[PDB]
Design an enzyme around this catalytic site. Structure first.
Site, mmCIF file in Angstrom:
data_model
loop_
_atom_site.group_PDB
_atom_site.id
_atom_site.type_symbol
_atom_site.label_atom_id
_atom_site.label_comp_id
_atom_site.label_asym_id
_atom_site.label_seq_id
_atom_site.Cartn_x
_atom_site.Cartn_y
_atom_site.Cartn_z
ATOM 1 N N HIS A 162 -10.712 18.244 -50.552
ATOM 2 C CA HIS A 162 -10.801 17.024 -49.644
ATOM 3 C C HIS A 162 -12.501 16.832 -49.518
ATOM 4 C CE1 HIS A 162 -9.739 13.936 -46.570
ATOM 5 N NE2 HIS A 162 -10.350 14.882 -45.831
ATOM 6 N N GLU A 187 -5.543 22.285 -54.124
ATOM 7 C CA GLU A 187 -6.258 21.516 -52.938
ATOM 8 C C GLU A 187 -7.604 22.103 -52.727
ATOM 9 O OE1 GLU A 187 -4.991 18.530 -52.589
ATOM 10 O OE2 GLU A 187 -3.047 19.189 -53.367
ATOM 11 N N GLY A 208 -13.414 20.076 -39.328
ATOM 12 C CA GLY A 208 -14.685 20.796 -39.323
ATOM 13 C C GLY A 208 -14.566 22.122 -40.109
ATOM 14 N N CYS A 252 -12.551 23.195 -42.628
ATOM 15 C CA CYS A 252 -11.911 23.378 -43.683
ATOM 16 C C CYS A 252 -13.015 23.974 -44.759
ATOM 17 C CB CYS A 252 -11.620 21.908 -44.394
ATOM 18 S SG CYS A 252 -10.261 21.206 -43.803
HETATM 19 C C1 LIG Z 1 -14.169 15.612 -43.618
HETATM 20 C C2 LIG Z 1 -13.198 15.730 -42.454
HETATM 21 O O1 LIG Z 1 -11.931 16.174 -42.636
HETATM 22 C C3 LIG Z 1 -11.817 17.510 -42.379
HETATM 23 O O2 LIG Z 1 -12.328 17.775 -41.374
HETATM 24 C C4 LIG Z 1 -11.123 18.517 -43.089
HETATM 25 C C5 LIG Z 1 -10.656 19.252 -41.701
HETATM 26 C C6 LIG Z 1 -9.104 19.260 -41.674
HETATM 27 C C7 LIG Z 1 -8.594 20.440 -41.048
HETATM 28 C C8 LIG Z 1 -7.553 19.818 -40.075
HETATM 29 C C9 LIG Z 1 -7.720 18.775 -39.168
HETATM 30 C C10 LIG Z 1 -6.614 19.101 -38.150
HETATM 31 N N1 LIG Z 1 -6.439 20.538 -38.063
HETATM 32 C C11 LIG Z 1 -7.029 21.224 -39.123
HETATM 33 O O3 LIG Z 1 -7.017 22.291 -39.213
HETATM 34 N N2 LIG Z 1 -8.311 19.048 -42.680
HETATM 35 C C12 LIG Z 1 -7.615 18.004 -42.840
HETATM 36 O O4 LIG Z 1 -7.716 17.091 -42.081
HETATM 37 C C13 LIG Z 1 -6.437 17.681 -44.049
HETATM 38 C C14 LIG Z 1 -5.504 16.889 -43.494
HETATM 39 C C15 LIG Z 1 -4.837 17.642 -42.316
HETATM 40 O O5 LIG Z 1 -4.902 18.542 -42.085
HETATM 41 C C16 LIG Z 1 -3.521 16.679 -41.665
HETATM 42 N N3 LIG Z 1 -2.508 17.639 -41.402
HETATM 43 C C17 LIG Z 1 -1.160 17.816 -42.351
HETATM 44 O O6 LIG Z 1 -0.965 16.852 -42.894
HETATM 45 C C18 LIG Z 1 -0.001 18.897 -41.872
HETATM 46 C C19 LIG Z 1 1.132 19.192 -42.248
HETATM 47 C C20 LIG Z 1 1.669 20.244 -41.584
HETATM 48 C C21 LIG Z 1 2.939 20.798 -41.601
HETATM 49 O O7 LIG Z 1 0.701 20.448 -40.633
HETATM 50 N N4 LIG Z 1 -0.400 19.752 -40.730
HETATM 51 C C22 LIG Z 1 -3.915 16.034 -40.390
HETATM 52 C C23 LIG Z 1 -4.964 15.153 -40.527
HETATM 53 C C24 LIG Z 1 -2.634 15.268 -39.858
HETATM 54 C C25 LIG Z 1 -7.438 16.745 -45.108
HETATM 55 C C26 LIG Z 1 -6.661 16.962 -46.317
HETATM 56 C C27 LIG Z 1 -5.831 15.904 -47.091
HETATM 57 C C28 LIG Z 1 -5.244 16.121 -48.168
HETATM 58 C C29 LIG Z 1 -4.994 17.303 -48.997
HETATM 59 F F1 LIG Z 1 -4.208 17.426 -49.902
HETATM 60 C C30 LIG Z 1 -5.616 18.364 -47.943
HETATM 61 C C31 LIG Z 1 -6.331 18.241 -47.068
#
Ligand SMILES: CCOC(=O)CC[C@H](C[C@@H]1CCNC1=O)NC(=O)[C@@H](CC(=O)[C@@H](NC(=O)c1cc(C)on1)C(C)C)Cc1ccc(F)cc1
Length: 182
Positions: free
Chosen positions: A41, A72, A146, A148
């Protein structure tokens, strides 16, 4: 708890870097040589910010396991002056769950942060914003945007990289040593 925390701290200076791509801020684990791992991501380009420096990227190769599944995560190689301390031996040969793990975050916005996530348990199949993967693990901690790339650690192993969450739980891609073989 304490033991995973101190092991996690021993990884920080030498192996856990603050980074920024066009997508935002991420934690990056350097593994050996000029090889590091990022969440897919983060979408690293031709240059990437590492700490205060804009560093050229040699390549970025998506990590796909031996069963043909995208994990991923992407393996990035860097035009850095120095090699990372080789932490291959701390990546377990088998994907591993663990009790009382520590999640290490290190970004500009969340510097040198140790998160007690509790028990990390098997989860398996995960559909992350419509992208399916497997071999994931879960912790009942309200992880946030933030975090990840954050490094999930046990008493003495690096077991996963934080990739997603739903507001109340967090999920990591599991690591095993063969993923980093040359
Ligand atoms: C650049 C800024 O983006 C970031 O901050 C990366 C940080 C966040 C951390 C999340 C942020 C929130 N709570 C957390 O821990 N990660 C993501 O957002 C991911 C999406 C989710 O976590 C989604 N969760 C699910 O699908 C999910 C499924 C189950 C089960 O539990 N969650 C949510 C956005 C909805 C981004 C992603 C998309 C496609 C993929 F191949 C792999 C990853």
């Amino acid at each position: 708890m304490g033991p995973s925390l101190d092991f996690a701290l021993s990884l920080l200076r030498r192996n856990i870097r603050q980074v920024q791509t066009d997508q935002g801020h991420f934690t990056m684990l350097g593994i050996r040589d000029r090889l590091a791992v990022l969440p897919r991501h983060s979408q690293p380009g031709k240059t990437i910010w590492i700490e205060h420096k804009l560093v050229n990227v040699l390549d970025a190769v998506e990590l796909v396991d031996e069963q043909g599944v995208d994990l991923e995560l992407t393996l990035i190689t860097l035009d850095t002056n120095e090699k990372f301390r080789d932490i291959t031996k701390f990546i377990p040969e088998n994907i591993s769950t663990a009790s009382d793990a520590t999640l290490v975050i290190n970004t500009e916005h969340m510097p040198s942060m140790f998160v007690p996530v509790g028990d990390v348990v098997q989860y398996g199949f995960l559909n992350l914003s419509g992208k399916p993967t497997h071999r994931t693990m879960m912790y009942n901690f309200p992880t946030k945007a933030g975090q990840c790339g954050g490094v999930v650690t046990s008493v003495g192993k690096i077991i996963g990289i934080h990739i997603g969450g739903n507001g109340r739980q967090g999920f990591c891609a599991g690591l095993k040593r063969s993923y980093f073989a040359s």
